[PDB]
Symmetry: D2
Subunit: 349 residues, 4 copies
Amino acid sequence: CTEYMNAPKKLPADVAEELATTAQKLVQAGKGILAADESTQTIKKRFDNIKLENTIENRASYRDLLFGTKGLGKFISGAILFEETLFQKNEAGVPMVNLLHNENIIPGIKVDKGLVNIPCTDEEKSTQGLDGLAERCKEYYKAGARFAKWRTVLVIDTAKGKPTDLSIHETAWGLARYASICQQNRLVPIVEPEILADGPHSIEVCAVVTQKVLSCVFKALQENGVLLEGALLKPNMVTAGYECTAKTTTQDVGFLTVRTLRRTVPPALPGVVFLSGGQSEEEASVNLNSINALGPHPWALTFSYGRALQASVLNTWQGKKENVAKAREVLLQRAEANSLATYGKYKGG
Amino acid sequence: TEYMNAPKKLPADVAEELATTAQKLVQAGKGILAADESTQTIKKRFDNIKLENTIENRASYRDLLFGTKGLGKFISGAILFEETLFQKNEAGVPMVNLLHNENIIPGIKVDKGLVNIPCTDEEKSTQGLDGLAERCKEYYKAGARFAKWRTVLVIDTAKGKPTDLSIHETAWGLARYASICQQNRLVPIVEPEILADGPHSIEVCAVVTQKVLSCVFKALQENGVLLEGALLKPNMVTAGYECTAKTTTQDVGFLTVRTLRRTVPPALPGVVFLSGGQSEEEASVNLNSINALGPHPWALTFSYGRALQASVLNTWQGKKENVAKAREVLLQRAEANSLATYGKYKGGAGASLYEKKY
Amino acid sequence: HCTEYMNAPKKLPADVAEELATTAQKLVQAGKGILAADESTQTIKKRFDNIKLENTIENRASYRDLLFGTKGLGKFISGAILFEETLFQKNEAGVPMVNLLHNENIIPGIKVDKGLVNIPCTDEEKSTQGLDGLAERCKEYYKAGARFAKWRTVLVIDTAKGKPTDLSIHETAWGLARYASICQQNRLVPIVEPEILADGPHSIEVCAVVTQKVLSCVFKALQENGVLLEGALLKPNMVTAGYECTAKTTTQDVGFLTVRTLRRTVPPALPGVVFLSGGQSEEEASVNLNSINALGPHPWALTFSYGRALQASVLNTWQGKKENVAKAREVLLQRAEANSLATYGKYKGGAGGENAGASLYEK
Amino acid sequence: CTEYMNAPKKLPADVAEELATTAQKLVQAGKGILAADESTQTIKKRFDNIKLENTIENRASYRDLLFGTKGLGKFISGAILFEETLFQKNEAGVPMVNLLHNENIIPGIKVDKGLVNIPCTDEEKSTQGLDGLAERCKEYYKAGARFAKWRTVLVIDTAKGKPTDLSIHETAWGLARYASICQQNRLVPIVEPEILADGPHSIEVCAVVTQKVLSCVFKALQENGVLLEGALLKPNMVTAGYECTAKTTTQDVGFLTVRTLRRTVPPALPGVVFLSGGQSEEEASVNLNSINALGPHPWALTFSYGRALQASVLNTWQGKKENVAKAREVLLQRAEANSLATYGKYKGGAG
């Protein structure tokens, strides 16, 4: 008869079930996510890193290059798209989404509207996007998108008490509100509280901060009634700071990352999809491999890489359309490299 | 360095301006005029006076309100919808200048309305944080010196409403809004309206309002909001609309003052009450009852719209003929509530029947 | 000092963290669980009256000797929770009771809470006492041989009165968190026990909702107080319908909704969950624990911390008699093994599987 | 007609009313509280500075000296006692509490059981005493006690992040629990979250930490259902740290203290009763005066002083039965000095 009222109420069976199946498919054994959700601005920085200007024709051709790759769906379960790309066609008539449906890859969509400063903090970041989010999700689901992405940024600066409480909770609560809005509108939310590697902090300090942040994130999720079974976490790997602290090894990066997750992420969460940050394409693969070499986990420990999958793909494409067959060969190589890291079976040489 | 885990302070310059504006907004004997009705909301008002909801009529009506000579004596500020803040009257003069001429501070509604919180039974979240900082910069240039953001909570005891999710979404939303405002030089009116809907007793409303406000002010300190440059716009503590045990104004006054004294710190310059579904007389009589209870640690004044405008429209009918007669009615109500600020409004129980002898 | 992140709990010394973790692992060993023998003088007097026997120090010592003196009991039991008296007690022939456990390889534990009191401004909701002098008692209990502790808190589900209230949930959450961090500092693995009572007519789904909310809150308090999950254990109620509800709930639901709730709230750094049998029968406690483990392999050990569910029938077949000791120790081993098999999801002894079934006509 | 369930329930009208009257009396106009709640542990040290043996006879004689002062009730509304003193009689057969009743002073009782380390913090302190507290209160009320005191300690060290969140909440939640138990058992709780002045931090930093701590303390109080009308706060004044050697004049001590309270303490709280910390007898009076010279406040801003009232009373006594009269004059002098500080009218200026 009477429910315990002071508790978030359940997702209707139908959507809860769909969210859970999408989430499981997204972390299928041997697969991960391709981050191709670069906005017009963030594409202009990478395109013009290898020359040839940032037009709608070049962007469409580049996303065609990525999503048109045969066999990529064996290593990639989902592709995070920017709004433009989601409704876009190739120079050939076909929806970009259909080429993901061809290769049997799930389309996703970035839904955050970027970062703004939290007042009364030293430039700590709040993520925008809740305004009209529900309505955008309905439109994105119709367009084919089955999962979402929302990025928030925290900073480790121990001297200045960063990340601060205000920063941690603005981030935690923002993600929780986003994630519940997606699930209501039939999209699996990728919850991304990226702690930046910037600074000279040790790996132990990063472990402490990441644990504190994640504990607080999951608390907000529960608060807001988010179904963990139909959600994914996209955290930073636990590493020493860029400015260094006895330049640690992959053995450590793997242990302190697995430990942190085991103390903070409940097993109802189907999987964690790691973000590469500033790591090299190779170290992103070596570190993911070190994480999975530490035995079979309660969740799928896989990847959501952008730069780590695309860097040498761009630099071996250079715009010219003769390289598409050749550029996709570099993509597949990296996709398989990270697929093997999922299994803990990626060595090197 | 200093203690790092606490919000940083506002610059001495803006903190001082916010504090001055907040004080002026709750000046002795003054309150705020809520003329912030959107196009959709003001359309429903013009139906009652069978008038076309056009840009011409809206401009003429706001001209009617802000063009009133002597309105500034009783009104310190006017909340506006975006359109009106940039709008002109039919004779070319910008309506913000009409407020300036009567020395009334212009304000601006910045929330983008309500949406459902998922996993709650239709409990409401207020939208508007996206691009808010930018809108504030634009509104300050336009002349606006304070803002308004409305959130709605509901009391339904059997259904555990307001639920915790509801209270904190509201609390945190208002805290973020207030902090973004103050950064951009606007005094935020923090409005956590608990609806009077339902049959709940006045004691239950007191319990809920106290819990909500305790939670709101926590979010406020959390986000680093300067209480000295902010204002609270709460519901008066009242029994619900369908409560058989019908209460009188003296209780509305007591349980409202109590609730505020247990939750609102005195750094807050003043509370500007919302009318709710109260009639014009009730809104004045109840505000008067609140202030009849001694002098308070903060200014207990009003932010009324319907309670100031209801009869003004009904003695106008859109006709330029009856403008003079509508101003009459606005100044009457404005003065009535100005007197209730002091606790000296009668406006029509010993009342002894005497006789004889010495 | 060095510029590390300062607004978080500081780590335990490497030495004690490691000991706590090994004890916690041993406490949830394969095929093992915990024996709750921590009955107070007042509570043990109630059970001795059901066998028409007197409650003296001699009888209590004899009964605990009966339990801990059982040969081979350590194959099914990893640890035994004791009441302070028993921890510092010798048997008939002057042998310390803790030594009886050492022989049988069982780890001794100790109840450290000082009972329940009402939270003011709630409708008789309960707060657990005991933080005063706790650190000191732990030092004394560790010297006495105790390697883990137990602290019980009680929440009630009454949906109409909004129980458990937020005040109740946090007093319990914070109390347990404080208790945990005091124990771990003093080298004792804390069993964190937020028992949600089965009392009332609530459905299983409502219990799942409340258990999930409570555990989410408990683990938040743990993390804030700096408790090492690797060196701690959780002792929750199984998720079940209220006692006064309808007249059913199938054990497969008790199993599903219990496993689900834990998967959404308990992070895998926690070595194991040790369930309390509450008001279940001895057989039901075994059948339900079996249903939980029949649901594939789990990220933690899902085992038992049973008292009544292990002792009810032993007390019965004993009645204070020196002769029945031999015979009663068989009933103990029977139940201990029954639950050991339930740990593996491999218990039957009464029915088997609630499926298939019938009369096969063969051809 | 059901009430809103997820909120702490009210105290019975009877006890709520009594708590509120006691709280009001405790911060009467021109009055404050005498902290005579020293343990045997701590009064030993004060007796050592006056070369006196710490015996039951001497302790009883000293408390007789304090509470036996004629016309002390004019300047003091309440006296916080140590358990021993509450049940003790003078070398004469007269109950100590009867001496308080004679001057119409309200007896109070210290109920905390001292401090212990919070594990996983750098020696930050948690206050003990919740075990059996309800029962002790019933006993203390029967003995005549009408209000209680519970001391918690936070430290400001900005480099080490103190007070850390764990420390702030353990303190806040402990005080809330203590407060709620007292009120249930008819005792007005003095909520004391002392932020120590130790360190070289500036007055602004102290204001920032005190504000944060008090915001969190009052949050716990609402959570636990504490009736603010029947409670008192005993905070540190906002001051610079002991080191640094900045100015930190009394006008600033007054301003930043008043500001902090106005941003954190709701007016339902009848009054704030300041602790002196390690301030000198005069400094404690001058600073309290500077606070009240900043105009009439929404609550009574008064004192709960021990050392700052007793230091010279003790030293000008030396344990000697002759010096009783003489020391009592020093006490009244100080009591009146701080009573005048209440009104903002102590030593009619210096600027």
